[PDB]
Design a protein around this ligand. Structure first.
Ligand SMILES: [Mg+2]
Lengths: 448, 100
DNA sequence: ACTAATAGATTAGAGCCGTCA
RNA sequence: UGACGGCUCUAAUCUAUUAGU
């Protein structure tokens, strides 16, 4: 019988310094922030893949609409939303061998066949980069098994952007099953898939669609994720870390402090002191050099709870007064509510408080402007708590709700969890394919 | 909005329609409503329009109403609890390997 | 000191489905 | 890897209680 607390929905920035709520709504309204026109593209693969990719590229030029448009807005032409020239008449194409030098059946060794295929693709791409004369930005690899991890890891050392597309994506019309019916039906999301592909291509080309300008100056945010690596001793180290929003000349810095600080244990997860201070110093020095000053507040995200001696080590790191506050987030607590009447769920934005520390937040539900729900069944909320430090309880709630929009890999209205942990997790698996790299690149476009 | 609303113009004071400090889409909606109520001459939509007739406004119908509602939870409460619990040690009430 | 069992409570990996009547 | 969510199973450490030596 306790009342709930609603929190407003922060807005994003767009061209000419305006604001909106749905990113694609603003895109159709104004468009991007910065200007990018270099989309000279190259494609490698077989004849069928090249032909279908060219057909798709000439198809995307005209506007298209989905089955229902009250939820998903209209998709105009690509020149009519961003402003560029994307065409199939300026593509550099190369042909993979038509015959197979790797046996068709995965009988000898599936790992060996995957390594051979990635070796062939990597060598062809490197020869193309180091031999030819043209200038290219992206590469749209068609595929006729944990493959792309190795390819991204092996292409990391050459600093070339890339993207992967599967053959089953485009030819769903004639890709019938064994009974003659199509396996996949994309007669409902074609506009949104076009939106996502265009946004991903524009980001990879070197252009940011939207930024943020309603954040408190002088504060910086951090996140940590943990993953297991299993070679001989199964030593779980991870510590891939994430990005940070250090203030600058009216921008949104998103570089991430990377480098898997080794933690040599099999069951211990939290942290070790020397790696802790190394990580914190590496995170802090970038702010120190960029802002030529010192931060006033440090915020730490965590996906799991952490020990105490790490905080003992971190206490001396605080230069003068910049106290660091560390919080934890989970993803599963059974509190499935039900609306008293009708057949409709609850809406996102409501928060629940049990004390000064714990809190339940609902980032899944419905939004009236979409008229529908983000989830299929009744949504379930998430839990937040300030593990270490003292801060206002609604501050972290509104902050964690604020960071649920910077999802550059898609264009959904909102996402389940904040992206600070999401991007760290995303880079985690692809960095661990081969850890023989020293000082990896810090930009967030090479890693997807 | 840097200029004060005082010195707008000498021969415009009697007229007041709209400002644009807030945003640029709700203003479009207001101007469209004004043109409709004053009956600006109509133009054919070529049977392809009226799709824009939804997102041309800044928000479709998103608002903040204060009407109250109730929700049914999933937990079940307990009112009465036993006062005490008992404690003992005899060490051969049952066979050791025998389970409890 | 550690290898056997007891259960509660955290934690991460993978593998299946629908696509919003 | 288009992208999201909702589910299922498998396993694993940290406490705290035993008895074999
Ligand atoms: Mg992606």
């Amino acid at each position: 019988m306790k009342e709930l607390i609603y929190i407003e929905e922060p807005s994003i920035l767009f061209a000419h310094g305006q604001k909106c709520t749905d990113p694609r709504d603003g895109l159709a309204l104004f468009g991007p922030l910065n200007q990018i026109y270099g989309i000279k593209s190259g494609v490698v693969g077989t004849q069928k893949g090249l032909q279908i990719f060219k057909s798709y590229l000439d198809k995307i030029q005209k506007p298209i609409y989905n089955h229902n448009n009250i939820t998903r807005p209209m998709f105009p032409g690509f020149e009519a939303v961003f402003g560029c020239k994307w065409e199939s008449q300026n593509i550099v194409f190369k042909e993979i061998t038509d015959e197979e030098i790797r046996r068709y059946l995965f009988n000898a060794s599936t790992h060996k066949r995957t390594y051979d295929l990635v070796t062939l693709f990597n060598d062809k791409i490197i020869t193309a980069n180091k031999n030819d004369e043209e200038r290219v930005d992206v590469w749209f690899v068609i595929v006729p098994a944990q493959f792309h991890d190795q390819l991204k890891a092996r292409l990391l050392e050459h600093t070339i952007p890339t993207q992967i597309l599967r053959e089953s994506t485009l030819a769903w019309r004639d890709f019938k099953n064994t009974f003659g019916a199509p396996i996949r039906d994309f007669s409902k999301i074609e506009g949104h898939l076009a939106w996502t592909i265009s946004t991903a291509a524009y980001y990879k080309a070197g252009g940011k669609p939207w930024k943020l300008g309603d954040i408190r100056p002088g504060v910086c945010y951090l996140g940590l994720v943990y993953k297991k690596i299993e070679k001989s001793k199964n030593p779980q180290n991870a510590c891939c870390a994430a990005q940070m929003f250090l203030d600058n000349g009216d921008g949104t810095v998103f570089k991430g402090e990377v480098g898997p600080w080794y933690n040599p244990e099999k069951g211990e997860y939290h942290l070790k002191p020397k790696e802790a201070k190394a990580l914190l110093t590496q995170a802090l020095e970038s702010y120190k050099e960029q802002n030529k000053s010192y931060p006033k507040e440090v915020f730490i995200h965590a996906r799991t709870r952490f020990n105490d001696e790490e905080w003992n080590a971190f206490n001396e790191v605080t230069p003068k007064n910049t106290n660091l506050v560390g919080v934890t987030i989970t993803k599963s607590k059974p509190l499935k509510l039900y609306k008293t009447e009708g057949a409709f769920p609850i809406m996102r934005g409501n928060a629940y408080i049990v004390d000064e520390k714990k809190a339940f937040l609902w980032t899944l539900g419905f939004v009236p402007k979409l008229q529908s729900t983000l989830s299929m069944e009744v949504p379930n909320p998430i839990f937040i708590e300030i593990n270490k430090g003292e801060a206002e309880i609604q501050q972290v709630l509104k902050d964690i709700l604020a960071l649920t929009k910077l999802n550059y890999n898609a264009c959904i209205y909102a996402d389940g969890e904040p992206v600070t942990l999401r991007f760290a997790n995303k880079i985690g698996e692809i960095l661990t394919a081969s850890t023989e790299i020293k000082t990896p690149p810090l930009a967030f476009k090479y890693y997807i | 909005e840097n200029l004060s609303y005082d010195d707008i113009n000498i021969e415009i004071v009697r007229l007041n329609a709209i400002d644009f400090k807030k945003s640029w889409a709700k203003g479009l909606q207001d101007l469209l409503d004004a043109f409709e109520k004053q009956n600006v001459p109509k133009k054919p939509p070529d049977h392809s329009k009226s799709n824009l007739l939804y997102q041309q406004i800044f928000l479709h119908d998103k608002q903040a109403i204060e009407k109250e509602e109730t929700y049914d939870s999933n937990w079940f409460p307990i009112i009465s609890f036993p006062n005490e619990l008992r404690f003992h040690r005899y060490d051969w009430r049952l066979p050791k390997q025998f389970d409890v």
